[PDB]
Amino acid sequence: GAPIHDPDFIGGIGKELIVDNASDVTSFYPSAFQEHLNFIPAPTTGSGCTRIPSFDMSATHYCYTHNVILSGCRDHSHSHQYLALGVLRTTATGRIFFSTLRSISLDDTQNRKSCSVSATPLGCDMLCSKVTETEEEDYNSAVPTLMAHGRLGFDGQYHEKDLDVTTLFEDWVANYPGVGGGSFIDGRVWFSVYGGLKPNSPSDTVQEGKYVIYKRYNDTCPDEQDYQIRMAKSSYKPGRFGGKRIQQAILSIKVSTSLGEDPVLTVPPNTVTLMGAEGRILTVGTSHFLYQRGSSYFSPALLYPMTVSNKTATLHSPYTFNAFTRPGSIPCQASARCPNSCVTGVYTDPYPLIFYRNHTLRGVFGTMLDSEQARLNPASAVFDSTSRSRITRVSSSSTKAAYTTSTCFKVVKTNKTYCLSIAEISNTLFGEFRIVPLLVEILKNDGVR
Amino acid sequence: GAPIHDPDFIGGIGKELIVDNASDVTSFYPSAFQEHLNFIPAPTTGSGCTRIPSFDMSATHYCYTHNVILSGCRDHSHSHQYLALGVLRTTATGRIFFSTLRSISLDDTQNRKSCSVSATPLGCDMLCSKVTETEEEDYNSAVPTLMAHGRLGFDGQYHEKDLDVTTLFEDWVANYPGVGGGSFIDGRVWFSVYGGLKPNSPSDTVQEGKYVIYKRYNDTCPDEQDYQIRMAKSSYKPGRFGGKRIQQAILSIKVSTSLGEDPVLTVPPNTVTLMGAEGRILTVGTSHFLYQRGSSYFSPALLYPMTVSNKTATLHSPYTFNAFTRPGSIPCQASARCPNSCVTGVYTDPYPLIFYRNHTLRGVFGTMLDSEQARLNPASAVFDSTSRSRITRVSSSSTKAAYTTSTCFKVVKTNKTYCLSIAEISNTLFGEFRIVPLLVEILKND
Numbered sequence: 018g019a020p021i022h023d024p025d026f027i028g029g030i031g032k033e034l035i036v037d038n039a040s041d042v043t044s045f046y047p048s049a050f051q052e053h054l055n056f057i058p059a060p061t062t063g064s065g066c067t068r069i070p071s072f073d074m075s076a077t078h079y080c081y082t083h084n085v086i087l088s089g090c091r092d093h094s095h096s097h098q099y100l101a102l103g104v105l106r107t108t109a110t111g112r113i114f115f116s117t118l119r120s121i122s123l124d125d126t127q128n129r130k131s132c133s134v135s136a137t138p139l140g141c142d143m144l145c146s147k148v149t150e151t152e153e154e155d156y157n158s159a160v161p162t163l164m165a166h167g168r169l170g171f172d173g174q175y176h177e178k179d180l181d182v183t184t185l186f187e188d189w190v191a192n193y194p195g196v197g198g199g200s201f202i203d204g205r206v207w208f209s210v211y212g213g214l215k216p217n218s219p220s221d222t223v224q225e226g227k228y229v230i231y232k233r234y235n236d237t238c239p240d241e242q243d244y245q246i247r248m249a250k251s252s253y254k255p256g257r258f259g260g261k262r263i264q265q266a267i268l269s270i271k272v273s274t275s276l277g278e279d280p281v282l283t284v285p286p287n288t289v290t291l292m293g294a295e296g297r298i299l300t301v302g303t304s305h306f307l308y309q310r311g312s313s314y315f316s317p318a319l320l321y322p323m324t325v326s327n328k329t330a331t332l333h334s335p336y337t338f339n340a341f342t343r344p345g346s347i348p349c350q351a352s353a354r355c356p357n358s359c360v361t362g363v364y365t366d367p368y369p370l371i372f373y374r375n376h377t378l379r380g381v382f383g384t385m386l387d388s389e390q391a392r393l394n395p396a397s398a399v400f401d402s403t404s405r406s407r408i409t410r411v412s413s414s415s416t417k418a419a420y421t422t423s424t425c426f427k428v429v430k431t432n433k434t435y436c437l438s439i440a441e442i443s444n445t446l447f448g449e450f451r452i453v454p455l456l457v458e459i460l461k462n463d464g465v466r
Numbered sequence: 467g468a469p470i471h472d473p474d475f476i477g478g479i480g481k482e483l484i485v486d487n488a489s490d491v492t493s494f495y496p497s498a499f500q501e502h503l504n505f506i507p508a509p510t511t512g513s514g515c516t517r518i519p520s521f522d523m524s525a526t527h528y529c530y531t532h533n534v535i536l537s538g539c540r541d542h543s544h545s546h547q548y549l550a551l552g553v554l555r556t557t558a559t560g561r562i563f564f565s566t567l568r569s570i571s572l573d574d575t576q577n578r579k580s581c582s583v584s585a586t587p588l589g590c591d592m593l594c595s596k597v598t599e600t601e602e603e604d605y606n607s608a609v610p611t612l613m614a615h616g617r618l619g620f621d622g623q624y625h626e627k628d629l630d631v632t633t634l635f636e637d638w639v640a641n642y643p644g645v646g647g648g649s650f651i652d653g654r655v656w657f658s659v660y661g662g663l664k665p666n667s668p669s670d671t672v673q674e675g676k677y678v679i680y681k682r683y684n685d686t687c688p689d690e691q692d693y694q695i696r697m698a699k700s701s702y703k704p705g706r707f708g709g710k711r712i713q714q715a716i717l718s719i720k721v722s723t724s725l726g727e728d729p730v731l732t733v734p735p736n737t738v739t740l741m742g743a744e745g746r747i748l749t750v751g752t753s754h755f756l757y758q759r760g761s762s763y764f765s766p767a768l769l770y771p772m773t774v775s776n777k778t779a780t781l782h783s784p785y786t787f788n789a790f791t792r793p794g795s796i797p798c799q800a801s802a803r804c805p806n807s808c809v810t811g812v813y814t815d816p817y818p819l820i821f822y823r824n825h826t827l828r829g830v831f832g833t834m835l836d837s838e839q840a841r842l843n844p845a846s847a848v849f850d851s852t853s854r855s856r857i858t859r860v861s862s863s864s865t866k867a868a869y870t871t872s873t874c875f876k877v878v879k880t881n882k883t884y885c886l887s888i889a890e891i892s893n894t895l896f897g898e899f900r901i902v903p904l905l906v907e908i909l910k911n912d
């Protein structure tokens with residue numbers, strides 16, 4: 018009942034779970050979906066949905082949030098944001114369960130969207146955008162998107178303060194949290210953000226001519242160099258949003274009793290980051306990572322190493338997991354290998370699981386959508402730079418998915434590793450999308466070699 | 467003031483759809499699920515369910531009803547009944563859709579259960595039982611189960627009258643509507659009913675020793691006759707309800723502005739009917755049928771021809787569709803071939819579809835649970851006495867199902883035949899049971 022993970026988990030949260038230098042990475046694999054957790058509420062109505070999940074867990078507690086629609090699941094409809102603070106516990110038999118300490122349903126008149134959450138010492142910090150217009154309409158409006166920093170504390174109270182986006186995002190026409198969780202580092206909470214830049218603004222101008230090409234493993238693009246460069250450059254300005262540059266950014270905010278205190282926006286050079294997209298900032302062991310959704314031409318899961326310098330951050334060449342692809346519209350489908358202009362893909366994050374002894378990330382766990390173009394066929398597996406382990410299908414090849422966010426941990430008492438995969442899924446005819454949490458133990462076949 | 471279906475369906479409701487004496491019956495088959503109709507409301511909550519569907523459609527309108535549970539789907543928790551009146555329509559494109567014109571959610575303190583609906587000239591008639599105890603407790607309770615006759619009129623108003631069960635069901639310890647739809651015939655509404663009889667009552671005395679054995683096509687039971695007869699006789703008094711005779715019956719009520727007017731309960735002899743169970747009264751063309759759920763040892767889908775005369779009914783030797791089996795617990799599983807005592811099975815009705823020129827029925831459409839023992843794998847198809855056509859699986863093999871009820875009709879304009887299949891189904895990670903309407907066109911390999 019204590020407001021902290023039960024003793025069995027103490028010391029098994031947020032660290033490098035598996036450190037192997039010999040044993041092959043893909044030798045580890047997910048077992049069957051165990052104890053179907055019930056900490057995530059079902060939709061309030063039978064005709065509504067729960068969508069856009071965000072999750073983050075510290076050494077003492079976890080934070081979770083999702084958006085609820087009462088009728089249908091159309092983005093152009095009123096919504097309510099559900100937010101919860103909880104901890105990991107075990108029953109007398111050892112059964113793992115996520116216990117909620119506090120939760121709140123923000124049912125006011127504000128229209129919060131694309132919210133990300135982070136577990137901080139003060140509770141559960143949330144970054145949301147507040148809008149009344151459509152996304153395409155947002156990028157059409159020169160002014161930035163309103164954003165707010167909120168927090169559900171251990172005392173159950175929720176507080177929030179709107180950020181001064183006029184100045185904070187002066188060079189932006191649209192800006193949203195990346196949905197994936199944020200991370201607490203050196204007294205500040207760090208959230209991945211993305212949106213569009215005001216053409217010719219100081220921020221835009223500094224990105225002119227900047228781009229980067231990430232190639233697939235053992236599958237080079239046939240297009241001529243001059244062509245790829247031309248297309249790579251154009252990937253930052255897709256036709257979907259009228260040519261505005263879609264930019265990746267990182268927002269850090271001081272964690273204290275004053276919400277929204279001293280926000281600082283960092284915009285990495287596009288010679289490192291690809292087109293802006295939904296994302297997540299996470300800390301595993303002593304390393305920090307920024308996951309970026311493959312909304313552009315690059316299909317394999319990206320994990321940009323992230324370093325912190327006071328109130329700002331720096332991203333380095335990303336880790337890539339070639340087999341951990343995502344579905345997308347042509348010419349940016351899962352098998353794509355050439356630079357192109359598109360706004361597709363889906364959020365399916367990879368969680369750092371296996372590392373070398375020198376702390377270099379080697380393998381990750383995640384629930385990919387095993388499909389070429391359509392958003393369907395969710396499947397959990399362990400991935401390394403080029404391969405995929407034995408998989409565990411979430412349901413059927415028909416199952417539709419919109420988001421999957423995974424976080425792994427260890428039960429020190431039994432020394433077993435588990436991975437939680439939260440997925441917004443739906444069946445061809447069982448209603449709208451709804452968020453479902455799944456747990457799997459990470460196994461290792463020894464009778465193999 | 468029946469709103470009437472669009473002129474495209476006129477003459478295409480409640481008639482013999484396919485008349486053929488040459489073509490192999492199973493040469494006709496369902497196409498892919500043409501559409502996902504929206505006329506059936508989803509559960510009110512994300513953690514609740516909608517269950518026990520009933521449907522019936524007459525020449526001018528259709529009637530539909532289902533039970534709603536707020537939390538979970540435990541057949542015990544408090545529940546409200548949803549009832550609707552609507553009509554068939556088509557968009558300019560010719561897209562078929564069911565339009566609900568009137569509906570009501572009965573949310574009072576009374577627990578209506580196992581309700582059946584019927585489309586009458588005055589609207590939508592509903593027969594329900596009202597209970598304050600489990601089924602087991604009811605059967606152990608000497609007094610009859612309360613029942614009411616209600617109606618949702620074209621004007622949107624709902625009126626209901628409790629029947630005098632103390633007299634009407636004096637020989638019964640428990641009684642419920644068959645869930646399947648009822649039918650309007652000769653000025654009255656007819657509902658299949660089932661329950662248990664009071665031992666030694668007049669109704670029970672007349673059934674004493676009566677039984678009937680229906681055999682599976684080319685799958686003869688090896689048991690010695692003496693043994694088969696003894697098992698058949700005991701199948702009417704299964705252990706599940708303490709040896710009470712589970713009886714099949716039919717209740718007809720005069721359709722008028724006065725609900726529950728002049729009720730008459732017919733109890734067919736058990737030399738014709740098997741153990742009482744859920745069922746439906748259907749009318750196709752000038753013929754009437756009683757579908758009886760295979761809750762006993764007989765697996766193939768049953769359709770007892772039904773004729774009526776002055777408030778009472780008479781059932782005859784049934785049509786049986788050997789490939790249209792249903793899952794059941796052993797020893798009464800889908801493949802069972804011998805008389806046995808059990809209370810299992812599931813409601814999956816067959817709709818009369820293909821007839822001979824002489825009006826004898828030869829083929830039906832239905833969504834069976836393509837399983838041996840577990841209630842899983844709903845699949846639609848056309849069936850004749852021995853075979854099954856190409857099928858159209860509803861979802862996955864692991865999909866659970868609790869009821870399927872089908873009704874077919876024709877779009878006279880395009881002369882195409884379609885079948886509506888309503889099914890209560892659920893899939894592992896997507897929540898409790900939910901009733902979903904499916905529509906398929908009937909095609910032919912010729």
Ligand SMILES: CC(=O)N[C@H]1[C@H]([C@H](O)[C@H](O)CO)O[C@](O)(C(=O)O)C[C@@H]1O
Pocket residue numbers: 069092130131152193294295312360361364419
């Ligand atoms: C603020 C916003 O509109 N978020 C939406 C994003 C963006 O439209 C997309 O990232 C722009 O490229 O797409 C989704 O994640 C998606 O496709 O499932 C739904 C989400 O609600």
Ligand SMILES: CC(=O)N[C@H]1[C@H]([C@H](O)[C@H](O)CO)O[C@](O)(C(=O)O)C[C@@H]1O
Pocket residue numbers: 518541579580601642743744761809811812868
């Ligand atoms: C009145 C009643 O209890 N009806 C119930 C029937 C009866 O139990 C059975 O037909 C006769 O005993 O079983 C179900 O169809 C079932 O299999 O789940 C549920 C339904 O609610």
Ligand SMILES: CC(=O)N[C@@H]1[C@@H](O)[C@H](O)[C@@H](CO)O[C@@H]1O
Pocket residue numbers: none
């Ligand atoms: C297996 C592996 O990763 N080897 C790398 C090598 O590719 C890289 O060139 C070198 C320099 O950093 O570091 C390691 O040796």
Ligand SMILES: CC(=O)N[C@@H]1[C@@H](O)[C@H](O)[C@@H](CO)O[C@@H]1O
Pocket residue numbers: none
């Ligand atoms: C194959 C076939 O239909 N044979 C029919 C039979 O079904 C029917 O009962 C009988 C009437 O006496 O006439 C024929 O024998």
Ligand SMILES: CC(=O)N[C@@H]1[C@@H](O)[C@H](O)[C@@H](CO)O[C@H]1O
Pocket residue numbers: 683684852
């Ligand atoms: C579908 C089927 O099996 N039909 C056969 C039939 O061809 C055969 O003439 C008869 C002999 O008794 O046995 C039936 O079972």
Ligand SMILES: *[C@@H]1O[C@H](CO)[C@@H](O)[C@H](O)[C@H]1NC(C)=O
Pocket residue numbers: 373374375376377
């Ligand atoms: C860790 O060891 C691997 C072994 O190949 C090597 O590739 C990698 O560069 C090393 N990383 C560090 C930080 O030493």
Ligand SMILES: *[C@@H]1O[C@H](CO)[C@@H](O)[C@H](O)[C@H]1NC(C)=O
Pocket residue numbers: 822824825826
């Ligand atoms: C219709 O024809 C079939 C087959 O010829 C026959 O078995 C059946 O008895 C006929 N029905 C009537 C009412 O004559």
Ligand SMILES: [Ca+2]
Pocket residue numbers: 154155156157158159160161162190191
């Ligand atoms: Ca704007």
Ligand SMILES: [Ca+2]
Pocket residue numbers: 603604605606607608609610611639640
């Ligand atoms: Ca009783």
